[PDB]
Design an enzyme around this catalytic site. Structure first.
Site, mmCIF file in Angstrom:
data_model
loop_
_atom_site.group_PDB
_atom_site.id
_atom_site.type_symbol
_atom_site.label_atom_id
_atom_site.label_comp_id
_atom_site.label_asym_id
_atom_site.label_seq_id
_atom_site.Cartn_x
_atom_site.Cartn_y
_atom_site.Cartn_z
ATOM 1 N N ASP A 34 10.260 -6.270 11.699
ATOM 2 C CA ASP A 34 11.458 -5.797 11.019
ATOM 3 C C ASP A 34 12.316 -4.806 11.818
ATOM 4 O OD1 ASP A 34 12.095 -3.852 7.997
ATOM 5 O OD2 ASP A 34 13.357 -5.313 8.939
ATOM 6 N N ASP A 214 19.357 -7.140 11.104
ATOM 7 C CA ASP A 214 18.103 -6.862 10.402
ATOM 8 C C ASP A 214 17.251 -8.125 10.243
ATOM 9 O OD1 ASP A 214 16.037 -5.864 8.837
ATOM 10 O OD2 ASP A 214 17.205 -5.621 7.069
#
Ligand SMILES: CCCCCc1ccc(C(=O)N(Cc2ccc(-c3ccc(C(=O)N4CCCCC4)cc3)cc2)C2CCN(Cc3ccccn3)CC2)nc1
Length: 329
Positions: A34, A214
């Site tokens: 992430d 992201d």
């Protein structure tokens, strides 16, 4: 390759995962990788929640390189608190290892039902030090400092459902993943991988929008007002109770996102943001876009964007590079 490559595996076009190990006995885990977070979260054998009983769990007693820390971590999520404590141990990512400070998780109940319903064990953050709990230097920064890699950068070539595999690459940029020019955008903060881009969709526009790249976000997110406007009169609807924004897959009114800088132009055509839902109706699609408001106008360029564009995350130069991903590998 001269670089460290971690293979990525797609899960139903919803999220992808990568494996890594913790402990000098190489305890295996599946991770969300992430860029929107900045710690490594690993469930402990000491965790007795129902969620943890389904997971691969970390046992510090089995590792010769475990170094006790114990600093308590309490963070609030959706379904309540997630708690644990810092530990240090060898973390292996691809063919590279280093002693690293991570969060050993004792209570996952604040991360349900997400945690129980998912096939991953942990989250490995790839953001900036200032985004982290406890001021932890990013893994890739730490690897560069130790001369294990020659550049403190990583790249994402996302897997595409029913087409090809994906790779997280640490340490260098490989030609096999992209075509055409790689263009770089300077970060507007060393926090998320956030850059400034002009956004246009049809007649709607937002100058110098904050765009966060992201990898852990499964959609594109758009300011709510900007979304409501851009979808007006497009034959896009909400059904009483099925999949959010739906449309015919062949809908010709569907717009193309355009993001521009002085350096580059990046577009996202409907084919990249539509998810087929044929089981509910012939030719029906869901739009993989959500409305989300930030204190300042902000787009999250999540997985649908990163599937089209190969991305380079450069800590040394405080920038994100973007190029068209090769369609096959
Ligand atoms: C044992 C593991 C402990 C994990 C503890 C934990 C929990 C949540 C986060 C977190 O905030 N995350 C990380 C997180 C990553 C992935 C997910 C995720 C994604 C997909 C899926 C998934 O595949 N499915 C399908 C199966 C069912 C569950 C959903 C599960 C979880 C959730 C949370 C957020 C997500 C939103 N991010 C974007 C953002 C940017 C800017 C401002 C606001 N938000 C920031 C980081 N971190 C650590």
């Amino acid at each position: 390759s001269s670089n460290d490559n971690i293979e990525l595996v797609d899960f139903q076009n919803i999220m992808f995962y990568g494996d890594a190990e913790v402990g000098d006995n190489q305890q295996p885990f599946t991770f969300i990788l992430d860029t929107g977070s900045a710690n490594l979260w690993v469930p402990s054998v000491k965790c007795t929640t129902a969620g943890c009983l389904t997971k691969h769990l970390y046992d510090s007693s089995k590792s010769r390189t475990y170094e006790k820390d114990g600093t308590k971590v309490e963070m609030n999520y959706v379904s309540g608190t997630v708690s644990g404590f810092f530990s240090k141990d060898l973390v292996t990512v691809g063919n590279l290892s280093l002693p690293y400070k991570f969060i050993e998780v004792i209570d996952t109940n604040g991360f349900e039902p997400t945690y129980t319903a998912s096939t991953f064990d942990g989250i490995l953050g790839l953001g900036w030090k200032d985004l982290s709990i406890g001021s932890v230097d990013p893994i890739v920064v730490e690897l560069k400092n130790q001369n294990k890699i020659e550049n403190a950068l990583f790249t994402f070539y996302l897997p595409v459902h029913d087409k090809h595999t994906g790779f997280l690459t640490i340490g260098g940029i490989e030609e096999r993943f992209y075509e055409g020019p790689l263009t770089y955008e300077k970060l507007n903060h060393d926090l998320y991988w956030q850059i400034t881009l002009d956004a246009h969709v049809g007649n709607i526009m937002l100058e110098k929008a904050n765009c966060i790249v992201d990898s852990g976000t499964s959609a594109i997110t758009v300011p709510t007002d900007f979304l409501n406007k851009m979808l007006q009169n497009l034959d896009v609807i909400k059904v009483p109770f099925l999949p959010f924004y739906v449309t015919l897959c062949n809908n010709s009114k569907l717009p193309t996102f355009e993001f521009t800088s002085e350096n580059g132009k990046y577009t996202l055509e409907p084919e990249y943001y539509l998810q087929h839902i044929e089981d509910v109706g012939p030719g029906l699609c869901m739009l993989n876009i959500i409305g989300l408001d930030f204190p300042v106008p902000t787009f999250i360029l999540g997985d649908p964007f990163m599937r089209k564009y190969f991305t380079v995350f450069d800590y040394d130069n405080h920038s994100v590079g973007i190029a068209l991903a090769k369609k096959n590998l």
